[PDB]
Amino acid sequence: GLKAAQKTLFPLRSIDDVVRLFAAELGREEPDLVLLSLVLGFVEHFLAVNRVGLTYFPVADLSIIAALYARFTAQIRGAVDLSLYPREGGVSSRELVKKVSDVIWNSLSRSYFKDRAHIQSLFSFITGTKLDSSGVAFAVVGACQALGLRDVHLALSEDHAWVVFGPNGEQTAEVTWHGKGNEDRRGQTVNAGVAERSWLYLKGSYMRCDRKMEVAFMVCAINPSIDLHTDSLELLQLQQKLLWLLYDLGHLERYPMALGNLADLEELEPTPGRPDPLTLYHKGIASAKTYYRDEHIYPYMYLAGYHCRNRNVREALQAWADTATVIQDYNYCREDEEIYKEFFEVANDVIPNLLKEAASLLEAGSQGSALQDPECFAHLLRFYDGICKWEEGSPTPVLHVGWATFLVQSLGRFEGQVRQKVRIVSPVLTFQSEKMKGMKELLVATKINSSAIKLQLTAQSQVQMK
Numbered sequence: 001g002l003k004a005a006q007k008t009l010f011p012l013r014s015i016d017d018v019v020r021l022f023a024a025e026l027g028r029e030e031p032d033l034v035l036l037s038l039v040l041g042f043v044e045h046f047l048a049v050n051r052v053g054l055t056y057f058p059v060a061d062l063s064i065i066a067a068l069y070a071r072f073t074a075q076i077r078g079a080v081d082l083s084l085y086p087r088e089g090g091v092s093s094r095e096l097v098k099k100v101s102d103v104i105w106n107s108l109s110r111s112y113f114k115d116r117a118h119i120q121s122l123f124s125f126i127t128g129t130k131l132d133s134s135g136v137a138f139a140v141v142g143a144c145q146a147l148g149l150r151d152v153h154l155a156l157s158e159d160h161a162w163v164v165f166g167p168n169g170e171q172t173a174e175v176t177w178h179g180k181g182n183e184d185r186r187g188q189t190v191n192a193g194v195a196e197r198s199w200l201y202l203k204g205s206y207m208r209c210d211r212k213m214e215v216a217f218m219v220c221a222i223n224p225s226i227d228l229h230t231d232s233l234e235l236l237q238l239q240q241k242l243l244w245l246l247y248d249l250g251h252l253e254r255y256p257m258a259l260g261n262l263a264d265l266e267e268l269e270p271t272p273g274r275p276d277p278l279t280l281y282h283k284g285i286a287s288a289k290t291y292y293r294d295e296h297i298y299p300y301m302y303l304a305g306y307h308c309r310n311r312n313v314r315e316a317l318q319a320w321a322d323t324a325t326v327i328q329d330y331n332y333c334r335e336d337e338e339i340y341k342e343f344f345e346v347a348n349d350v351i352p353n354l355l356k357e358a359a360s361l362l363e364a365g366s367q368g369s370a371l372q373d374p375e376c377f378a379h380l381l382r383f384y385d386g387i388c389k390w391e392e393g394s395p396t397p398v399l400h401v402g403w404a405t406f407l408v409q410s411l412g413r414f415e416g417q418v419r420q421k422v423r424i425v426s427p428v429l430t431f432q433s434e435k436m437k438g439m440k441e442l443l444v445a446t447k448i449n450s451s452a453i454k455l456q457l458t459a460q461s462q463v464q465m466k
């Protein structure tokens with residue numbers, strides 16, 4: 001509106017007052033995305049971007065928030081003439097979605113760093129004319145809500161955002177850019193990306209938000225970071241309390257990564273009487289299995305990262321094996337580089353460092369070490385197997401020799417007597433990838449044949465002539 005009922009809690013003087021506003025909006029037929037994003041962006045600005053003069057909490061006065069809200073609605077309503085886009089059947093047209101996208105896009109500053117922190121909210125859009133990639137998609141949805149377009153909703157993969165709209169909510173439209181140096185596809189469907197089985201479009205198992213999930217998205221989008229070394233405790237608390245509010249209302253049920261975010265916040269500062277982080281990570285994985293065909297990678301990464309921080313090598317390896325079992329059924333496509341980077345860093349930095357410490361602890365007499373557990377060797381092998389299977393049939397390759405030395409080193413952290421205990425069948429493990437099937441006979445030698453492993457992992461045809 002803003003409607004009278006939306007104004008009664010102002011001024012917001014504390015974290016808890018912001019939570020009360022979110023609770024009130026989430027109890028309405030349609031929570032007001034523009035109001036909520038402006039409030040979060042205002043408090044984030046004064047808690048993380050500029051803390052000069054902060055004494056407790058940046059009071060959000062109604063006059064200030066209402067003026068920002070009016071700037072947004074005036075910009076959208078003045079620029080989008082709905083009479084040019086008649087709404088057949090109470091649903092929106094592709095041309096109307098494209099117009100809203102164009103209005104947001106054309107408002108942005110001509111040159112700025114797109115990966116900056118704190119450019120996600122409508123506060124940033126209004127005051128700085130800057131948005132990050134997914135911020136543009138959220139702003140399009142908020143503008144559509146402000147215009148009365150109840151069918152336009154945010155769609156989210158694990159690395160991109162777009163909109164759904166139209167009859168039955170069945171149309172898709174790109175509304176923002178993805179990554180750096182890719183060609184704009186605004187206004188097009190996501191069908192080519194779904195059909196090519198890229199990770200970017202999740203084989204179609206992406207999130208189709210309702211309004212409550214769009215509120216969850218903006219809460220996950222809070223960025224508490226003040227600088228590289230410092231987070232705002234106030235914004236961490238706000239994000240944590242808002243995620244618990246959403247959790248209790250059922251609005252995280254279909255949002256795996258939000259459950260992982262909540263688990264990470266609980267690990268940092270547990271809330272008495274709430275579930276443990278592990279329970280929450282497992283709920284995020286359950287959500288992905290239940291609603292998204294177990295086609296998401298990050299729920300397992302969140303779990304693996306917790307185990308890795310807790311130096312629980314066995315369960316970290318299991319969770320990484322599970323990430324690879326998801327990725328194996330994708331084709332590695334152009335624009336999937338973010339997930340390639342995660343696997344590369346896990347394989348070639350994180351696992352090596354974890355196993356190096358495990359080896360030192362084993363030398364010092366550790367008992368029950370992952371390095372003496374053949375099931376942990378099997379998890380390592382299953383991790384590589386899924387990456388090799390991912391590569392099969394893909395338009396771009398995954399493995400190269402820069403992976404091969406780390407594989408040889410990690411395999412060799414397990415003594416041959418441990419490695420011998422895994423039965424590879426066509427502790428028991430079955431390989432899905434042809435690369436790992438051919439590597440089987442190299443996996444039990446006391447001194448692994450490093451050159452042969454490298455040949456098998458990279459499918460290198462030849463050794464040096466001379």
Ligand SMILES: CNc1nc(NC2CCN(Cc3ccc4c(cc(C#N)n4C[C@]45C[C@](NC=O)(C4)C5)c3C)CC2)c2cc(CC(F)(F)F)sc2n1
Binds near residue numbers: 220261
């Ligand atoms: C909360 N809601 C939420 N979150 C989203 N993305 C989150 C994805 C996970 N990251 C953290 C992160 C990043 C890498 C990690 C782990 C855990 C592990 C593990 N193991 N790794 C791999 C590592 C270990 C490494 N190296 C040294 O340690 C990092 C390699 C973790 C938790 C934070 C953002 C998105 C994206 C959307 C699409 C958009 F809208 F944006 F278009 S919607 C949306 N919603």
